Write an enzyme that holds these catalytic residues in place. Structure first.
Site, PDB file in Angstrom:
ATOM      1  N   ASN B   8       0.828  -1.161  -0.269  1.00 23.61           N
ATOM      2  CA  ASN B   8       0.393   0.170  -0.417  1.00 23.61           C
ATOM      3  C   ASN B   8       1.325   1.269  -0.053  1.00 23.61           C
ATOM      4  O   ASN B   8       1.960   1.849   0.813  1.00 23.61           O
ATOM      5  CB  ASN B   8      -0.845  -0.069   1.274  1.00 23.61           C
ATOM      6  CG  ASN B   8      -1.429   1.422   1.890  1.00 23.61           C
ATOM      7  OD1 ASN B   8      -2.211   2.014   0.691  1.00 23.61           O
ATOM      8  ND2 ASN B   8      -2.534   1.069   2.524  1.00 23.61           N
ATOM      9  N   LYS B  10       0.030   4.253  -0.618  1.00 22.88           N
ATOM     10  CA  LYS B  10      -0.710   5.610  -0.001  1.00 22.88           C
ATOM     11  C   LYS B  10      -0.366   6.794  -0.822  1.00 22.88           C
ATOM     12  O   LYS B  10      -0.554   6.522  -2.192  1.00 22.88           O
ATOM     13  CB  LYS B  10      -0.379   5.697   1.822  1.00 22.88           C
ATOM     14  CG  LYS B  10       0.246   4.428   2.868  1.00 22.88           C
ATOM     15  CD  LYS B  10      -0.238   4.923   3.862  1.00 22.88           C
ATOM     16  CE  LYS B  10      -0.471   3.712   4.580  1.00 22.88           C
ATOM     17  NZ  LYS B  10      -0.420   3.838   6.332  1.00 22.88           N
ATOM     18  N   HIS B  93      -9.839   0.892   5.360  1.00 24.19           N
ATOM     19  CA  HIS B  93      -8.915   1.012   5.859  1.00 24.19           C
ATOM     20  C   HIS B  93      -8.906   2.180   6.431  1.00 24.19           C
ATOM     21  O   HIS B  93      -9.883   3.640   6.601  1.00 24.19           O
ATOM     22  CB  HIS B  93      -7.826   2.166   4.855  1.00 24.19           C
ATOM     23  CG  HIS B  93      -6.542   1.473   5.074  1.00 24.19           C
ATOM     24  ND1 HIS B  93      -5.371   2.868   6.352  1.00 24.19           N
ATOM     25  CD2 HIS B  93      -5.023   0.934   5.326  1.00 24.19           C
ATOM     26  CE1 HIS B  93      -4.741   2.266   6.570  1.00 24.19           C
ATOM     27  NE2 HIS B  93      -3.966   1.569   5.647  1.00 24.19           N
ATOM     28  N   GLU B  95      -7.294   5.023   8.129  1.00 30.65           N
ATOM     29  CA  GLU B  95      -6.998   6.697   7.622  1.00 30.65           C
ATOM     30  C   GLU B  95      -8.349   7.022   7.235  1.00 30.65           C
ATOM     31  O   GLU B  95      -8.367   7.674   7.171  1.00 30.65           O
ATOM     32  CB  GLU B  95      -6.109   6.348   6.142  1.00 30.65           C
ATOM     33  CG  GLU B  95      -4.540   6.916   7.728  1.00 30.65           C
ATOM     34  CD  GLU B  95      -3.457   5.871   6.496  1.00 30.65           C
ATOM     35  OE1 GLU B  95      -3.452   5.996   5.586  1.00 30.65           O
ATOM     36  OE2 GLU B  95      -2.151   5.440   7.056  1.00 30.65           O
ATOM     37  N   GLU B 163      -6.049  -4.768  11.417  1.00 38.43           N
ATOM     38  CA  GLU B 163      -4.657  -3.189  12.074  1.00 38.43           C
ATOM     39  C   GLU B 163      -4.940  -3.251  13.431  1.00 38.43           C
ATOM     40  O   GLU B 163      -5.486  -2.774  13.369  1.00 38.43           O
ATOM     41  CB  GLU B 163      -5.240  -1.758  10.918  1.00 38.43           C
ATOM     42  CG  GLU B 163      -5.575  -2.469   9.337  1.00 38.43           C
ATOM     43  CD  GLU B 163      -5.687  -0.913   8.575  1.00 38.43           C
ATOM     44  OE1 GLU B 163      -6.969  -0.580   8.903  1.00 38.43           O
ATOM     45  OE2 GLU B 163      -5.644  -0.298   8.080  1.00 38.43           O
ATOM     46  N   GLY B 169       1.272   3.822  15.745  1.00 41.46           N
ATOM     47  CA  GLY B 169       1.284   5.226  16.151  1.00 41.46           C
ATOM     48  C   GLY B 169       0.935   5.914  17.765  1.00 41.46           C
ATOM     49  O   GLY B 169       0.894   6.504  18.049  1.00 41.46           O
ATOM     50  N   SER B 209       2.645  -2.499  11.726  1.00 40.38           N
ATOM     51  CA  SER B 209       4.102  -2.152  10.988  1.00 40.38           C
ATOM     52  C   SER B 209       4.493  -3.545  10.966  1.00 40.38           C
ATOM     53  O   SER B 209       5.050  -4.119  12.078  1.00 40.38           O
ATOM     54  CB  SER B 209       5.043  -1.286  12.351  1.00 40.38           C
ATOM     55  OG  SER B 209       3.998  -0.090  12.455  1.00 40.38           O
ATOM     56  N   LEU B 228      -0.323  -5.938   4.403  1.00 41.80           N
ATOM     57  CA  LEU B 228      -0.584  -4.963   3.993  1.00 41.80           C
ATOM     58  C   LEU B 228       0.791  -4.172   4.741  1.00 41.80           C
ATOM     59  O   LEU B 228       0.094  -3.429   5.164  1.00 41.80           O
ATOM     60  CB  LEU B 228      -1.909  -4.713   4.291  1.00 41.80           C
ATOM     61  CG  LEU B 228      -2.625  -2.923   3.598  1.00 41.80           C
ATOM     62  CD1 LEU B 228      -2.573  -3.944   2.349  1.00 41.80           C
ATOM     63  CD2 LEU B 228      -3.356  -2.798   4.506  1.00 41.80           C
ATOM     64  N   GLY B 230       3.001  -1.481   4.679  1.00 49.00           N
ATOM     65  CA  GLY B 230       2.798   0.403   4.481  1.00 49.00           C
ATOM     66  C   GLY B 230       4.080   1.214   3.805  1.00 49.00           C
ATOM     67  O   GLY B 230       4.349   0.675   2.545  1.00 49.00           O
ATOM     68  N   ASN B 231       4.761   1.885   4.653  1.00 44.41           N
ATOM     69  CA  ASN B 231       6.016   2.481   4.325  1.00 44.41           C
ATOM     70  C   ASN B 231       7.075   1.829   4.101  1.00 44.41           C
ATOM     71  O   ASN B 231       8.091   1.987   2.419  1.00 44.41           O
ATOM     72  CB  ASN B 231       6.418   3.759   5.222  1.00 44.41           C
ATOM     73  CG  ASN B 231       5.885   4.772   5.685  1.00 44.41           C
ATOM     74  OD1 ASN B 231       5.269   5.387   4.231  1.00 44.41           O
ATOM     75  ND2 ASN B 231       5.035   5.103   6.514  1.00 44.41           N
TER      76      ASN B 231
END
Lengths: 246, 246
Positions: B8, B10, B93, B95, B163, B169, B209, B228, B230-231
């Site tokens: 993803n 993003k 998602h 977000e 998730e 975070g 993460s 899935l 992320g960064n």
């Protein structure tokens, strides 16, 4: 001030219908230095549409994110738009304010992100039927414009669009006369909070139901500098609405 | 069960950064009949990414509309996605639940529109830190999954993603044993409402993460079928994460 004709295809189209519609548009003979003509296709249709349209036409996207690059799944940032040479973006449309709860504060944050990344913006606003029936149109309009007017650094790069919600879907109609009055009022608000030179160079487009039968009456109003066409922009006859402005 | 590894991206990337990343991804030799590898770029980067990635890689978009075609400025419909042969769509998602107020009701309807149009869906959900502290993880996860699971007409076309917002975070870290406990319970919910056969065939990915250091210890868990990402998927070393699932 130069006339502006925009096509908002909204959430419509297939690769085929777009190939068919862009060919008709391309047959229109016009000088882009004397008239701005922009087309706003669905985001995933962008490349394809940009490739079929002659440079006469400018292109943009129907929405842009209030955030920048980062962890925002599904959003298209202004820097991403800038990297792709996307020139315009639409902001504050009432379908986005209604179905997706965008506020005046999202409108200003998006306008700021766009101006920061050198994109031209088409900002939308207008009052509902309930508000017009209570003689509140000017109060509502001044509140919506005040939310973002102070960011306009170049009054050629920001285009305003007045959407008469009271006359959209309510089974009521707007007379060019009733439109010109609001445009004049909007221009006065810009003159009084930005200056006279600014007010006279900024375009204010009519964003109501525009077709081939009434497009001529609207453009001829001194304070109506063009339109943001919805449905009618999905038809080949859209070339007629563009001719009325040249 | 085929493992599933998704990138993803993003709201990130430029034409040149994507060109350099796809190049690197194309160097990894893997068999798509044994492993699903999907990458989700920003909507306006889709054509560009699809052309650069070799057909062994699947592609999708980060969000779809709950409405079909029509007057919904800024939205992309399942029906438009189908015409372009867009294979996967991400739904629910966090977000989008957080910044754009999407609800379980929305998730349900986007899943229904997606399945009606032959798109495959990656459905996200999970509890927050506050909910985890009140010992409501299971209660929350049960309600979120039950909001849409009765729609799964076909357990190879819908992928679930847990998730752990409570560790996204906040400074908490989710351990493999902790994720496994929840994945096992997610699969039980599916067993309880769809059938035991269905529950053993559906993929449940971990969406917390993920990186090159912790991937192998997560994919190795009995109820974790992929991730899935992320960064970590914006780097070249992403290939190493795919490898852990080979």
């Amino acid at each position: 001030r130069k006339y502006f004709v925009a096509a908002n295809w909204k959430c419509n189209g297939t690769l085929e219908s777009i190939k068919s519609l862009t060919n008709s548009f391309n047959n229109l003979d016009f000088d882009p230095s004397k008239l701005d003509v922009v087309v706003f296709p669905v985001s995933v249709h962008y490349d394809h549409t940009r490739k079929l349209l002659q440079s006469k036409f400018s292109t943009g996207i129907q929405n842009v994110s209030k955030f920048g690059n980062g962890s925002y799944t599904g959003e298209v940032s202004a820097e991403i738009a800038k990297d792709l040479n996307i020139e315009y973006v639409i902001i504050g449309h009432f379908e986005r304010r209604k179905y997706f709860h965008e506020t005046d504060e999202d409108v200003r944050e998006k306008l700021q992100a766009s101006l920061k990344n050198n994109l031209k913006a088409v900002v939308c606003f207008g009052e509902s039927l309930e508000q017009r029936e209570q003689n509140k149109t000017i109060e509502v309009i001044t509140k919506q414009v005040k939310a973002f007017v102070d960011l306009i650094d170049n009054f050629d790069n920001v285009i305003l669009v007045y959407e008469p919600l009271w006359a959209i879907g309510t089974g009521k109609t707007a007379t060019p006369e009733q439109a010109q009055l609001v445009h004049k009022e909007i221009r006065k608000i810009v003159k009084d909070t930005c200056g006279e030179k600014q007010a006279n160079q900024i375009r204010i487009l009519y964003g109501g139901s525009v077709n081939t039968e009434n497009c001529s009456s609207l453009i001829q109003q001194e304070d109506i500098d063009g339109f943001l066409v919805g449905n009618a922009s999905l038809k080949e006859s859209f070339v007629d609405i563009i001719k009325s402005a040249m």
